[PDB]
CSV table of C-alpha atoms and ligand atoms in Angstrom, one decimal:
chain,number,residue,atom,x,y,z
A,14,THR,CA,103.2,92.9,97.3
A,15,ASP,CA,106.0,90.5,98.4
A,16,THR,CA,104.6,88.3,95.5
A,17,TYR,CA,106.2,91.0,93.2
A,18,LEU,CA,109.6,91.4,95.1
A,19,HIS,CA,112.8,90.4,93.2
A,20,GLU,CA,116.6,90.7,93.7
A,21,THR,CA,119.2,91.3,91.0
A,22,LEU,CA,122.9,92.3,90.9
A,23,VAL,CA,123.2,95.9,89.8
A,24,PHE,CA,126.9,96.7,89.1
A,25,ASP,CA,128.6,95.6,92.4
A,26,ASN,CA,125.4,95.6,94.6
A,27,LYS,CA,122.4,93.2,95.1
A,28,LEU,CA,119.3,95.5,95.0
A,29,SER,CA,115.7,94.4,95.7
A,30,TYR,CA,112.9,95.9,93.4
A,31,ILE,CA,109.2,95.4,92.9
A,32,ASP,CA,108.1,94.4,89.3
A,33,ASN,CA,104.5,93.1,88.8
A,34,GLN,CA,105.8,91.9,85.3
A,35,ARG,CA,102.4,93.1,83.9
A,36,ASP,CA,102.3,92.5,80.0
A,37,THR,CA,100.4,95.6,78.7
A,38,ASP,CA,100.8,98.9,76.8
A,39,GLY,CA,103.3,101.4,78.2
A,40,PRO,CA,104.5,103.4,79.9
A,41,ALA,CA,105.9,101.4,82.8
A,42,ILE,CA,105.3,103.2,86.2
A,43,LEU,CA,108.7,103.7,88.1
A,44,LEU,CA,107.9,104.5,91.8
A,45,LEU,CA,111.1,105.9,93.4
A,46,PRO,CA,111.4,105.7,97.2
A,47,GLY,CA,112.9,108.6,99.2
A,48,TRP,CA,115.8,108.0,101.7
A,49,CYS,CA,115.8,105.3,104.4
A,50,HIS,CA,112.5,103.6,103.3
A,51,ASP,CA,111.7,101.0,100.6
A,52,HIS,CA,108.9,99.7,98.2
A,53,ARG,CA,106.7,99.2,101.4
A,54,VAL,CA,105.8,102.9,101.2
A,55,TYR,CA,104.1,102.2,97.8
A,56,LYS,CA,102.1,98.9,98.7
A,57,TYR,CA,98.7,100.8,98.6
A,58,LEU,CA,99.7,102.8,95.4
A,59,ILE,CA,100.9,99.5,93.8
A,60,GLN,CA,97.3,98.1,94.5
A,61,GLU,CA,95.8,101.2,92.7
A,62,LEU,CA,98.0,100.7,89.5
A,63,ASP,CA,98.6,96.9,89.5
A,64,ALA,CA,95.8,95.9,87.1
A,65,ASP,CA,96.5,98.5,84.3
A,66,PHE,CA,100.3,99.1,84.4
A,67,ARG,CA,103.7,97.5,84.7
A,68,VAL,CA,104.9,98.8,88.1
A,69,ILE,CA,108.6,98.8,89.0
A,70,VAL,CA,109.9,100.0,92.5
A,71,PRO,CA,113.7,99.9,92.9
A,72,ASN,CA,115.3,99.9,96.4
A,73,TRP,CA,118.5,101.9,96.9
A,74,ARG,CA,121.9,100.5,98.1
A,75,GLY,CA,121.5,99.3,101.7
A,76,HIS,CA,117.7,99.6,101.5
A,77,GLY,CA,114.9,96.9,101.6
A,78,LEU,CA,113.5,94.3,104.0
A,79,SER,CA,117.0,93.7,105.4
A,80,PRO,CA,118.9,97.1,105.4
A,81,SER,CA,122.7,97.0,105.3
A,82,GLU,CA,125.8,99.2,105.7
A,83,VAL,CA,127.2,100.0,102.2
A,84,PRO,CA,129.7,102.5,100.7
A,85,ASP,CA,128.8,106.2,100.3
A,86,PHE,CA,126.6,107.1,97.2
A,87,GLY,CA,124.4,110.0,96.1
A,88,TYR,CA,121.4,110.6,93.8
A,89,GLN,CA,123.7,110.3,90.6
A,90,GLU,CA,124.3,106.6,91.7
A,91,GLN,CA,120.5,106.1,92.4
A,92,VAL,CA,119.7,107.2,88.8
A,93,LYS,CA,122.3,104.8,87.3
A,94,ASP,CA,121.0,102.0,89.6
A,95,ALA,CA,117.4,102.8,88.5
A,96,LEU,CA,118.3,102.7,84.8
A,97,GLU,CA,120.5,99.5,85.0
A,98,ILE,CA,117.4,97.8,86.6
A,99,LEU,CA,115.1,99.1,83.7
A,100,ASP,CA,117.8,97.9,81.1
A,101,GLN,CA,117.8,94.3,82.7
A,102,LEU,CA,113.9,94.3,82.5
A,103,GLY,CA,113.8,95.5,78.8
A,104,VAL,CA,111.7,98.6,79.8
A,105,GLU,CA,111.9,101.6,77.3
A,106,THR,CA,109.3,104.4,78.1
A,107,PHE,CA,108.6,105.0,81.8
A,108,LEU,CA,106.7,107.5,84.0
A,109,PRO,CA,108.9,108.3,87.0
A,110,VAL,CA,106.9,109.0,90.3
A,111,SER,CA,108.9,110.1,93.4
A,112,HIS,CA,108.2,110.6,97.1
A,113,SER,CA,110.1,113.5,98.9
A,114,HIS,CA,113.9,113.5,98.2
A,115,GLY,CA,113.4,110.6,95.7
A,116,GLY,CA,112.7,113.9,93.7
A,117,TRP,CA,116.5,114.5,93.1
A,118,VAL,CA,116.7,111.0,91.5
A,119,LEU,CA,113.5,111.7,89.4
A,120,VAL,CA,114.8,115.1,88.0
A,121,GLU,CA,118.3,113.7,87.3
A,122,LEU,CA,116.6,110.6,85.7
A,123,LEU,CA,114.6,112.9,83.4
A,124,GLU,CA,117.9,114.6,82.4
A,125,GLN,CA,119.9,111.3,81.9
A,126,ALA,CA,117.0,109.3,80.2
A,127,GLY,CA,115.8,112.3,78.1
A,128,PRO,CA,112.2,113.1,77.0
A,129,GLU,CA,111.8,110.0,74.7
A,130,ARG,CA,112.2,107.4,77.5
A,131,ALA,CA,110.8,109.8,80.3
A,132,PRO,CA,108.4,112.3,78.7
A,133,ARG,CA,106.8,113.3,82.1
A,134,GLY,CA,107.3,113.1,85.9
A,135,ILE,CA,105.2,113.2,89.1
A,136,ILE,CA,106.9,114.4,92.3
A,137,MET,CA,105.0,113.7,95.5
A,138,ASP,CA,105.4,115.8,98.8
A,139,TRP,CA,108.9,117.3,98.0
A,140,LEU,CA,110.0,120.5,99.8
A,141,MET,CA,110.1,122.9,96.9
A,142,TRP,CA,112.0,125.7,98.8
A,143,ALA,CA,115.5,125.8,100.3
A,144,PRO,CA,115.5,124.3,103.9
A,145,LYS,CA,113.7,126.4,106.6
A,146,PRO,CA,115.5,126.6,110.1
A,147,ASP,CA,113.5,123.5,111.4
A,148,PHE,CA,114.3,121.2,108.5
A,149,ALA,CA,118.0,122.5,108.3
A,150,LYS,CA,118.2,121.6,112.0
A,151,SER,CA,116.8,118.1,111.3
A,152,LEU,CA,119.5,117.3,108.6
A,153,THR,CA,122.2,118.5,111.1
A,154,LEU,CA,120.8,116.0,113.7
A,155,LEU,CA,120.6,113.1,111.1
A,156,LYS,CA,124.4,113.5,110.3
A,157,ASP,CA,125.3,113.6,114.1
A,158,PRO,CA,126.2,109.9,115.1
A,159,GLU,CA,125.1,110.9,118.7
A,160,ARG,CA,121.7,112.5,117.8
A,161,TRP,CA,120.5,110.8,114.5
A,162,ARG,CA,117.5,109.0,116.1
A,163,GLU,CA,116.4,112.3,117.8
A,164,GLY,CA,116.7,113.7,114.2
A,165,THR,CA,114.3,111.0,112.8
A,166,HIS,CA,111.7,111.6,115.7
A,167,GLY,CA,111.5,115.3,115.0
A,168,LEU,CA,110.9,114.5,111.3
A,169,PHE,CA,108.2,111.8,112.2
A,170,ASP,CA,106.4,114.5,114.2
A,171,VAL,CA,106.4,117.0,111.3
A,172,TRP,CA,105.3,114.3,108.7
A,173,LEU,CA,102.4,113.1,110.9
A,174,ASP,CA,101.4,116.8,111.5
A,175,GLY,CA,99.5,115.9,114.8
A,176,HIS,CA,97.4,113.0,113.1
A,177,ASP,CA,96.8,109.5,114.6
A,178,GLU,CA,97.2,108.2,111.0
A,179,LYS,CA,97.5,104.4,111.6
A,180,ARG,CA,99.0,103.3,108.2
A,181,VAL,CA,101.6,106.2,108.1
A,182,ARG,CA,102.6,105.6,111.8
A,183,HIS,CA,103.1,101.9,110.8
A,184,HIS,CA,105.4,102.9,108.0
A,185,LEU,CA,107.6,105.3,110.1
A,186,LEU,CA,107.7,103.2,113.4
A,187,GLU,CA,107.7,99.6,112.0
A,188,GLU,CA,108.8,99.8,108.3
A,189,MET,CA,111.7,102.3,108.8
A,190,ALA,CA,112.7,100.9,112.2
A,191,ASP,CA,115.6,98.7,110.9
A,192,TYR,CA,117.4,101.8,109.2
A,193,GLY,CA,120.4,103.0,111.3
A,194,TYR,CA,122.9,105.9,111.3
A,195,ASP,CA,124.5,104.7,108.0
A,196,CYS,CA,121.4,105.4,105.9
A,197,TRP,CA,120.0,108.4,107.9
A,198,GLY,CA,123.5,110.1,108.2
A,199,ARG,CA,123.9,109.7,104.4
A,200,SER,CA,120.3,111.0,103.7
A,201,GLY,CA,121.2,114.2,105.7
A,202,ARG,CA,124.6,114.6,103.8
A,203,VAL,CA,123.1,113.9,100.3
A,204,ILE,CA,119.9,116.1,100.7
A,205,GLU,CA,121.9,119.0,102.4
A,206,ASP,CA,124.4,118.8,99.5
A,207,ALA,CA,121.6,118.5,96.8
A,208,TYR,CA,120.1,121.9,98.0
A,209,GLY,CA,123.5,123.6,98.4
A,210,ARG,CA,124.6,122.4,94.8
A,211,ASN,CA,121.2,122.7,92.9
A,212,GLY,CA,119.7,125.5,95.0
A,213,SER,CA,116.2,124.0,95.2
A,214,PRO,CA,114.0,121.3,93.4
A,215,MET,CA,112.5,124.2,91.5
A,216,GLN,CA,115.9,125.7,90.4
A,217,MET,CA,117.0,122.1,89.3
A,218,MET,CA,113.8,121.4,87.2
A,219,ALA,CA,114.0,124.9,85.6
A,220,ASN,CA,117.6,124.0,84.7
A,221,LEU,CA,116.7,120.8,82.7
A,222,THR,CA,118.2,120.8,79.1
A,223,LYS,CA,114.7,119.4,78.0
A,224,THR,CA,111.8,120.7,80.1
A,225,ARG,CA,108.7,118.4,80.1
A,226,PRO,CA,105.3,118.1,82.0
A,227,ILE,CA,106.0,117.8,85.8
A,228,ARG,CA,103.3,117.8,88.5
A,229,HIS,CA,104.0,118.4,92.2
A,230,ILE,CA,101.2,116.6,94.2
A,231,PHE,CA,101.5,117.3,98.0
A,232,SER,CA,99.4,117.5,101.3
A,233,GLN,CA,102.3,119.2,103.3
A,234,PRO,CA,103.3,121.9,104.2
A,235,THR,CA,99.7,123.2,104.5
A,236,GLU,CA,100.6,126.9,104.9
A,237,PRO,CA,99.3,129.3,102.2
A,238,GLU,CA,102.9,130.7,101.6
A,239,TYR,CA,104.0,127.2,100.4
A,240,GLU,CA,101.0,126.9,98.0
A,241,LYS,CA,102.1,130.4,96.7
A,242,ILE,CA,105.7,129.2,95.6
A,243,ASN,CA,104.0,126.4,93.7
A,244,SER,CA,101.4,128.7,92.0
A,245,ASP,CA,104.1,131.3,91.2
A,246,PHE,CA,106.4,128.6,89.7
A,247,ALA,CA,103.4,127.2,87.8
A,248,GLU,CA,102.5,130.7,86.3
A,249,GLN,CA,106.2,131.1,85.2
A,250,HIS,CA,106.6,127.5,83.7
A,251,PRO,CA,103.9,126.1,81.2
A,252,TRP,CA,105.3,122.6,81.9
A,253,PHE,CA,104.8,122.8,85.8
A,254,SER,CA,101.5,122.0,87.6
A,255,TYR,CA,100.6,121.1,91.2
A,256,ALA,CA,97.6,119.6,93.0
A,257,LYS,CA,97.1,120.0,96.8
A,258,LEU,CA,95.7,116.5,97.8
A,259,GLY,CA,94.5,117.6,101.3
A,260,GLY,CA,95.7,114.4,102.9
A,261,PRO,CA,96.7,114.5,106.7
A,262,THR,CA,100.4,113.5,106.4
A,263,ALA,CA,103.5,114.0,104.2
A,264,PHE,CA,102.9,110.5,102.8
A,265,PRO,CA,100.1,110.8,100.3
A,266,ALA,CA,101.0,107.4,98.6
A,267,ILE,CA,100.0,105.8,102.0
A,268,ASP,CA,97.1,108.0,103.2
A,269,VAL,CA,95.4,109.2,99.9
A,270,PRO,CA,96.6,106.4,97.5
A,271,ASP,CA,93.4,106.7,95.3
A,272,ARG,CA,94.2,110.5,94.8
A,273,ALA,CA,97.9,109.9,94.0
A,274,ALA,CA,96.8,107.2,91.5
A,275,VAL,CA,94.4,109.4,89.4
A,276,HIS,CA,97.2,112.0,88.9
A,277,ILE,CA,99.6,109.1,87.8
A,278,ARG,CA,96.8,107.7,85.5
A,279,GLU,CA,96.2,111.2,83.9
A,280,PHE,CA,99.9,111.5,83.1
A,281,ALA,CA,100.2,107.8,81.9
A,282,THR,CA,97.1,108.4,79.6
A,283,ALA,CA,98.6,111.7,78.2
A,284,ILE,CA,101.9,109.6,77.3
A,285,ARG,CA,99.7,106.8,75.7
A,286,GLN,CA,98.1,109.5,73.4
A,287,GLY,CA,100.5,110.4,70.5
B,301,VFH,C1,111.4,108.7,103.5
B,301,VFH,C2,111.9,110.1,103.8
B,301,VFH,C3,111.3,111.3,103.5
B,301,VFH,C4,111.9,112.5,103.8
B,301,VFH,O1,111.4,113.6,103.5
B,301,VFH,C5,113.3,112.5,104.3
B,301,VFH,C6,114.0,113.7,104.7
B,301,VFH,C7,115.3,113.6,105.2
B,301,VFH,C8,115.9,112.3,105.4
B,301,VFH,C9,115.3,111.2,105.0
B,301,VFH,C10,114.0,111.3,104.5
B,301,VFH,N1,113.2,110.1,104.2
B,302,K,K1,101.8,125.8,84.4
């Protein structure tokens, strides 16, 4: 995967990004990381798609193999960064795919890019409802310069859901280990503000000027009440669908990459037709 890793100057920042520079029929597949992780979350998903698609994975400001303190930014800046990278590469039509709170970037990317460039979207494991007491408590801890690491440990416990899942534990304990208070504190502020300002991922997607096919694919939360908000939103919106992947962790791109990949291919094939 490091075979495909590049660096370029985006506005005032040097950002890393995966590009397999595959020469083939579109759309390109834009994999969008969440907060305080990088392209390494997608290394198994990249292997599923590598052969048949151009695969781009931008890293956010202060994100990558060598994390760094950088000035404050939000999901609006993540979208502009993602699009400046696509402009530099000469990419027109793309299928955005997000993990967790990468979702705020994806939905704003759909709005900013419009349904010509971005006719569909896949959001993976993104909390569709307003924060529950537990998660609200986690964001609080992430913003506390005293208690941010305690914050991340609580989240790691929720995401692993009691599983000895070797590849996901490697991602959280080795691949996220170099991220400090600067990223995590900012993730807490941006996510807490995203919910407060947009209400929920569902309110934000319903509010798009141009609604389009979006699929939520998730393994967590596993409770029937969470599946019901997805089914109820799906019944209300012809353009919304979900699949419960039944993987063990909140990281389906890592632990069920083959399942993640068939939903991406289905949406990529639908774009290729017409
Ligand atoms: C990678 C990743 C997933 C999440 O759900 C999340 C939530 C809060 C802060 C940072 C985060 N980072
Ligand atoms: K539907």
